Design a protein around this ligand. Structure first.
Ligand SMILES: Nc1nc2c(ncn2[C@H]2C[C@H](O)[C@@H](COP(=O)(O)NP(=O)(O)OP(=O)(O)O)O2)c(=O)[nH]1
Ligand SMILES: [Mn+2]
Ligand SMILES: [Mn+2]
Length: 538
DNA sequence: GACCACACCGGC
DNA sequence: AAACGCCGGTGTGGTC
């Protein structure tokens, strides 16, 4: 490419180099653009951002987030990564996409701009005739990248002082647990080392091994194994408690306070758009899609996520979403009637599990039933189910039997999805998002059947992800008009932030947009709460 | 210091 | 651990 002076013409593709992967924290080291056989390198990258109409190129959203951080309303446009991801969701990195579609991902801005132009040309042509993937690109993924850019630059408020005080209380309890574990072991050791713990439990103590680890075949110390040994020795229960507290302290309580941005005073995640095999987003740096909620301590951590003063959080979450999606995809009349009657399969499975009336099912029980309902749907074995519920093997076998007997067209849909996946080489969502599963033809049964579980899960999980994305695209402009903020997406949930006096109107509107995103054979019901913290809004 | 595999476990 | 699926973060033990 011929070198030309900054600025570039309108519509040029950008390349850029960040001091680090996280756009909210990175220095903009270099900026360049390419168009019409020329490359334009910016002498002063920061000031040079003001010359761009949009961020068009590889990782476009990252540059848009950095621009918004600096007060510049630079939206992301075309991104070859999104094209590649729609053609094959194993296209997750610029390194791989470049090698695959005609370039090399380097560390120079000008070459990255030239690469973005070359890759877009080639990838755009590969989507000729792919009407459904083209619709997903233009109507979902490309506009969604702008929504996510704004969400990333906005962040969420965190009660730092609260978490600092919580850390000290948890530290004292961890001390009580480890000191007890060492007394029971007869000697201290590194309780964070699963190798050392393995030797204590199975060699020094006389506990029987239950399972082995995957890659190295060590005697497992997993929670599932410890639960099986809960009654064999009093050290086991303490280890499980130590694990819970240290997991939450090391992963949330201690690190999150240190990630508050100095200018915004809020916590900023990255919403990765080309990271999963199914079409889901992921969240990283930090991951805000796995904040605790299940245990008492976890709920205390979730309470640290708060609204700006004078505002409230609004949390919306699709009801039984993948089961509703399954009803539409499979057309099972029995499953459709379930939701047309307003029933709750999680609460009903819970009622059976704990032998109590539906009105007596608490959230803890219902959450456990959610795990059972989807575990069985996507292929959980009777053996594992019998151990999860502490019931005889024959009773777990009977539950799985009635589960599918209740919804006969589900098995039919699974078989048809797998047969089509073998012929075409891929499975697809309701909107045509595809995942290639070559191991459906594997000649090793264990491999083939693992691929089968991956394969018929994807249309269900992926359709739910398609629906959530489309709802975000529809909802975002309405929230801007209302002066509200979209903060987080957690797969089938949105967390919004609204002025207190508008919180109710925002909650009603967001609920209606999400429930009407795309009418199916069953209604899509959305549960909504409002509160000053994330837990309260649930 | 960065990076890695591994086992593991937080969420949906 | 076991024939649930999809993620990202941690400490250990180890290399470089
Ligand atoms: N395979 C699998 N999928 C899961 C699991 N947990 C969640 N998912 C998938 C399937 C779930 O549909 C989806 C969203 O998870 P939620 O919002 O926590 N539960 P839901 O929407 O079902 O019920 P309600 O909102 O009324 O409580 O994530 C699991 O253990 N396994
Ligand atoms: Mn839900
Ligand atoms: Mn949810």
């Amino acid at each position: 490419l011929e070198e030309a002076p900054w600025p570039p013409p309108e519509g040029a593709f950008v390349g850029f180099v960040l001091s680090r992967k996280e756009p909210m924290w990175a220095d903009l080291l270099a900026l360049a653009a390419a168009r019409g056989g020329r490359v334009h390198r910016a002498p002063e990258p920061y000031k040079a951002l003001r010359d761009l109409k949009e961020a068009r190129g590889l990782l476009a959203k990252d540059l848009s987030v950095l621009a918004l951080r600096e007060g510049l309303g630079l939206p992301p446009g075309d991104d070859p990564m999104l094209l590649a991801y729609l053609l094959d969701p194993s296209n997750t990195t610029p390194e791989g996409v470049a090698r695959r579609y005609g370039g090399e991902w380097t560390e120079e801005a000008g070459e990255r701009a030239a690469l973005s132009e070359r890759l877009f040309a080639n990838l755009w042509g590969r989507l000729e005739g792919e009407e459904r993937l083209l619709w997903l690109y233009r109507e979902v993924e490309r506009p969604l990248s702008a929504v996510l850019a704004h969400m990333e630059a906005t962040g969420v408020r965190l009660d730092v002082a609260y978490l600092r005080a919580l850390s000290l209380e948890v530290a004292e309890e961890i001390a009580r647990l480890e000191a007890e574990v060492f007394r029971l072991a007869g000697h201290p050791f590194n309780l964070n080392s699963r190798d050392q713990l393995e030797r204590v439990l199975f060699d020094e103590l006389g506990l029987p091994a239950i399972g082995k680890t995957e890659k190295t075949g060590k005697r497992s110390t997993s929670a599932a194994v410890l639960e099986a040994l809960r009654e064999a020795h009093p050290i086991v229960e303490k280890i499980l408690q130590y694990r819970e507290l240290t997991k939450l302290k090391s992963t949330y309580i201690d690190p999150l306070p240190d990630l508050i941005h100095p200018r915004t005073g809020r916590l900023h995640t990255r919403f990765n758009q080309t990271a999963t095999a199914t079409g889901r987003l992921s969240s990283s740096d930090p991951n805000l899609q796995n904040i605790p909620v299940r245990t008492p301590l976890g709920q205390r951590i979730r309470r640290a996520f708060i609204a700006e003063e004078g505002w409230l959080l609004v949390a919306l979450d699709y009801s039984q979403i993948e089961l509703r999606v399954l009803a539409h995809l499979s057309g099972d009349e029995n499953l459709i009637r379930v939701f047309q009657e307003g029933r709750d399969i999680h609460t009903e499975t819970a009622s059976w599990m704990f032998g109590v009336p539906r009105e007596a099912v608490d959230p803890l029980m219902r959450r456990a039933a959610k795990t059972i309902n989807f575990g069985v749907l996507y292929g959980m074995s009777a053996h594992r189910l019998s151990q999860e519920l502490a019931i005889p093997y024959e009773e777990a076998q009977a539950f799985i039997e009635r589960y599918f007997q209740s919804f006969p067209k589900v098995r039919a849909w699974i078989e048809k999805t797998l047969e089509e996946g073998r012929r075409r080489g891929y499975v697809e969502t309701l909107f045509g998002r595809r995942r290639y599963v070559p191991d459906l033809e594997a000649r090793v049964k264990s491999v083939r059947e693992a691929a089968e579980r991956m394969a018929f899960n994807m249309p269900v999980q992926g359709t739910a992800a398609d629906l959530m994305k489309l709802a975000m695209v529809k909802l975002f402009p309405r929230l801007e008009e209302m002066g509200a903020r979209m903060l987080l997406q957690v797969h089938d949930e949105l967390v919004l932030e609204a002025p207190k006096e508008r919180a109710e109107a925002v909650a009603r509107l967001a609920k209606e947009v999400m429930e009407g995103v795309y009418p199916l054979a069953v209604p899509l019901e959305v549960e909504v709460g409002i509160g000053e913290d994330w837990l309260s809004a649930k």
